[PDB]
Amino acid sequence: ALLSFERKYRVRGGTLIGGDLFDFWVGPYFVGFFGVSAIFFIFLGVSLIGYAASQGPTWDPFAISINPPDLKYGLGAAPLLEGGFWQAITVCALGAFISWMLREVEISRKLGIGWHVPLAFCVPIFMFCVLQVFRPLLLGSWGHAFPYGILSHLDWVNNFGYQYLNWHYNPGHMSSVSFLFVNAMALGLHGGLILSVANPGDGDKVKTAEHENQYFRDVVGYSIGALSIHRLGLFLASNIFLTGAFGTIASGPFWTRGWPEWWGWWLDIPFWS
């Protein structure tokens, strides 16, 4: 059950709700009140998915799709088969994600560590809300949100992009993509570096912090240091969505033309027109 070093940390306390009532483990998993709400919402969501899927055409996991309502239903409840299942499932997902986050808070308090992880996990919960809640509120229908299917959701991303002619030219997207790419690079650099220090191989000896910083100074004239690459990492990753959100929320409510056209602000200044 327990890691060699685990028993000493496995103490009572650090909950947010319920004190001792849900303060226990099952196997390796901490439970908490928010473990219980999580499982509740997962069960409900997965049930609702299974029921909805059986009423549909196929059972191929690639081709299953639970879609939101038509636009004509605006912000109302829709009949279950024609968007209600999607509405219910959306609520269960948010229940599950927020539970998962708050559970991580409780686990952080018990260990006496920072809340940075649940904090970082708010970012993707927020971005999910941008797509499924906030942007559909501003446009006025739930039918603007994305369908739950492995491949069907890609068809939505696809068409949504082409509603604005060339989505690549969306400035929030440009920012988002740049953070996605630079974040992946940096993870490779970081992971590479650490392993390069602890694993020179050929029985050669493990190196030092000094070696870490010397390597990057030599190659690119600067080394951000050990703690800071972790701060930068969290920052770069989180900005994939924090900036992308603006580009997503802008498209429709604050901009109805194609995204390349938006660059008129620059191209069409009279001074050089």
Partner 1 sequence: MYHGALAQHLDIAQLVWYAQWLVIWTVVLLYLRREDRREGYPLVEPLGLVKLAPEDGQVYELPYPKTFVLPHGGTVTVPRRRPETRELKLAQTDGFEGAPLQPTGNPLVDAVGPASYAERAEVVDATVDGKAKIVPLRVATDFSIAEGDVDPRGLPVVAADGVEAGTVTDLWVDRSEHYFRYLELSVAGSARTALIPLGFCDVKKDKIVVTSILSEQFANVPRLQSRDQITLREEDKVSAYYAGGLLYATPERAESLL
Partner 2 sequence: ADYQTIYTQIQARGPHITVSGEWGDNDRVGKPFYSYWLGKIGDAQIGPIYLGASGIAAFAFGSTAILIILFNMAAEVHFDPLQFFRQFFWLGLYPPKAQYGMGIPPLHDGGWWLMAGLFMTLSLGSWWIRVYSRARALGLGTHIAWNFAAAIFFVLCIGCIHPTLVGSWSEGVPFGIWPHIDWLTAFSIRYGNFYYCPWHGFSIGFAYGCGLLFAAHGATILAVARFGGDREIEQITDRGTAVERAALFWRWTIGFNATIESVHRWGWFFSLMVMVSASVGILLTGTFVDNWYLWCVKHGAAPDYPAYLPATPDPASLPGAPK
Partner 3 sequence: CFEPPPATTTQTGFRGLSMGEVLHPATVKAKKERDAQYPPALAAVKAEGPPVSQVYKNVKVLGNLTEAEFLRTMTAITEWVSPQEGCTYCHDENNLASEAKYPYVVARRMLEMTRAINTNWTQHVAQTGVTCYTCHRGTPLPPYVRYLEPTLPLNNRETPTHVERVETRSGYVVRLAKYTAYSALNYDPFTMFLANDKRQVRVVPQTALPLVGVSRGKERRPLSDAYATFALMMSISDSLGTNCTFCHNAQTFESWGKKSTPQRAIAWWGIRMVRDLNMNYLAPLNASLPASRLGRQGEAPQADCRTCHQGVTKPLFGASRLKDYPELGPIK
Ligand X SMILES: C/C=C1/c2cc3[nH]c4c(c3C)C(=O)[C@H](C(=O)OC)c4c3nc(cc4[nH]c(cc(n2)[C@@H]1C)c(C(C)=O)c4C)[C@@H](C)[C@@H]3CCC(=O)OC/C=C(\C)CCC[C@H](C)CCC[C@H](C)CCCC(C)C
Site string (46-85) toward ligand BCB, x via CB under 6 A: x--x------------------------------------
> Terminal CA-to-CA distance of the chain, rounded, Å?
72
Q: What is the DSSP string of 92-148?
A: HHHHHHHHHHHHHHHHHHHHT--SHHHHHHHHHHHHHHIIIIIHHHHHT-GGGS--B
Task: Return the one option of ligand BCB, partner 2, partner 3, none that residue 261 interacts with (CB less than 5 to 8 A, by type).
Answer: partner 3
Residue 201 CB coordination number (10 Å): 6
C-alpha to C-alpha distances, 162 to 19, 167, 170, nearest whole angstrom: 51, 7, 11
Q: Which CB atom, from 29 or from 162, has the smaller least distance to ligand HEC?
A: 162
Say whether residue 118 binds ligand MQ7 (CB under 6 A).
no
255 forms beta bridges with 251
Say whether residue 206 binds partner 1 (CB under 8 A).
yes
Say whether residue 117 binds ligand X (CB under 6 A).
yes
Residue partners of 220: CB distance under 8 A and separation at least 6: none
Largest Cα–Cα distance in the chain?
72
Say whether residue 39 binds partner 2 (CB under 8 A).
no
User: Exactly one of 80, 120, 129, 224 binds ligand X (CB under 6 A); which one?
Assistant: 120
Residue type, 58: T
Q: Which CB atom, from 16 or from 91, has the smaller least distance to partner 2?
A: 16
Backbone angle region of 70, left / alpha / beta, with phi > 0 → left and psi within -120 to 50 → alpha: beta
Site string (135-164) toward ligand HEC, x via CB under 6 A: ---------------------------x--
Q: Residues interacting with ligand MQ7, by CB under 6 A?
A: 26, 29, 31, 35, 38-39, 42
Residue ranges binding ligand HEC (CB under 6 A): 162, 165
Question: Which residues would be at the binding site for partner 1 (CB under 8 A)?
Answer: 1-20, 23-27, 109-113, 198, 203-211, 213, 225-227
